[PDB]
């Protein structure tokens, strides 16, 4: 979920 949570955070 981490890499997806980051993307969602930045984007």
């Amino acid at each position: 979920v981490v890499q997806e949570a980051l993307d969602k955070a930045r984007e």
Partner: single-chain antibody
Amino acid sequence: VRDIVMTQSPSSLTVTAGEKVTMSCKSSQSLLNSGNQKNYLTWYQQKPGQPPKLLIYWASTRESGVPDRFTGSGSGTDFTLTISSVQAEDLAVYYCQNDYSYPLTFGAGTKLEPEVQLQQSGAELVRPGASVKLSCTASGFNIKDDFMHWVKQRPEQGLEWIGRIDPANDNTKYAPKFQDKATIIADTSSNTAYLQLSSLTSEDTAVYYCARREVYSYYSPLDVWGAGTTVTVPS
């Protein structure tokens, strides 16, 4: 849904200078992201009295400054850290961390036997049943640009992820076992992150560290760790 267990071995290992050491880190579940083919495994080196130092992330990429004699390898569920020729200043304990999916979990580690920073509040002495607030102030960057994490570590040595918050949207994520005992708050105004523990027991006696994770890069592990605040709950 489980948690993903990190099993490190050997736990202890008397070593003699020059020797070759090989530490193993296995995960209960895949740590591989088939999307970008990266293994979300990070290695930390920790000398006594200090907070974990970032060694390697994504399984094999060495952080800037770590000697070539250190090598991270493995894929999916089997990872290993190797020191081609152990040096003196190489001792300490080593932890591998699951950075693939929440909650982030650390292994028990392998103990080898022979300006950007985070300001943390003073040591605490508290009675069982009480609550205490710990503080973490970034001194070199804006916390609105990072995820502020809280890590626990009792005298044992095992690192325990408590949770993390997104100062920008106040979005927080908590490890299952700390979902009640902990509450993470952020105040971008003062650029400080707080952690509150309630209903303290002797099980809470430990060293609490805060850490940051940049969210502007595509990806980044937990690099900057505060010195930590010792919380003592005498039974």
